[PDB]
Amino acid sequence: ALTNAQILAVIDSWEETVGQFPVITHHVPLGGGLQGTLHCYEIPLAAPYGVGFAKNGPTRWQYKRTINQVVHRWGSHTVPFLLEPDNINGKTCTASHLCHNTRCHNPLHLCWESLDDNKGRNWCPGPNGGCVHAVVCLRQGPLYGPGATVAGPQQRGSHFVV
Amino acid sequence: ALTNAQILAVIDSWEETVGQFPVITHHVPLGGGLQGTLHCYEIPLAAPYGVGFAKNGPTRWQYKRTINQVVHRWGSHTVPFLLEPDNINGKTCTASHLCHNTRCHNPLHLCWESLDDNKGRNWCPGPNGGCVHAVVCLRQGPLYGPGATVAGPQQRGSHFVV
């Protein structure tokens, strides 16, 4: 809600509730042939999810609280960043999963960045494979690799140059 | 429907028309602090675009040919790949701009791959910066770099560990 005190109280209640989600250990590629361990705090698969939480999509949730007799609602991963600017360079700020695990709500696995920055982490080589993200990746992106390209650049005639 | 010879004739007509598009020389980052040059064959900004071409969206075009009284139509960048498989690993193949220039129709700047592989090239460090794409990038992706993250992972209490 409007007051900084009210916002801190929302963040604190959110953290307390998410802190009771089951902690699931995931072993993950870091890049460079190395492996690490992440501890994700995962929202349940089905109702009930926790005080204040409800599912609005297969992998989408919202957090809601009643303040001054009014309901206030947020995307479930946006709550840690309620005191941050909600845009950057004219682009909407988004909650970005460093662990690439949608159900996870561990704020130590989230950052707040443009949708382009967010998406791009899917292909990052990782913190031990050359990640250059200023807010560093926690793991190699799940889509990093050589790809599966069916056909490369080609011409039949002689009209084009690279 | 269309025979192999007829499909080859469609590709040849497409190449002959695109070959006459304005050729624009662009200096581009290759990764590793090096600069290279790409030559893009750019479809015009407004009609007329060239024989067989029409705009279906702000940055979308189609190629159309009528053969034996039947109208055939293709996405304007898909024509080089009409003799290739149209899916791989259960994913639809898409025309993917190695030059990251939508208006460009140079077939030496296109490859044919899943939409995820396609998107991922936006963040590639480039052919002289560590590209691991099996069909190699022609340039560093426009979105490669440290990013502009507004807020990183953080908690107010002590409920979480990474």
Added chain:
DNA sequence: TTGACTCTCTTAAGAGAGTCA
């Protein structure tokens, strides 16, 4: 047969808001 427009759809990273009990 052709040109120049029109419309909606896909994907996978993300969102907001309403209906009931």
Added chain:
DNA sequence: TTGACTCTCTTAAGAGAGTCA
């Protein structure tokens, strides 16, 4: 007030198909 559902929207890489002359 809190819970458990419903619906559609945004972005930026990509698509198919209709209408009229």
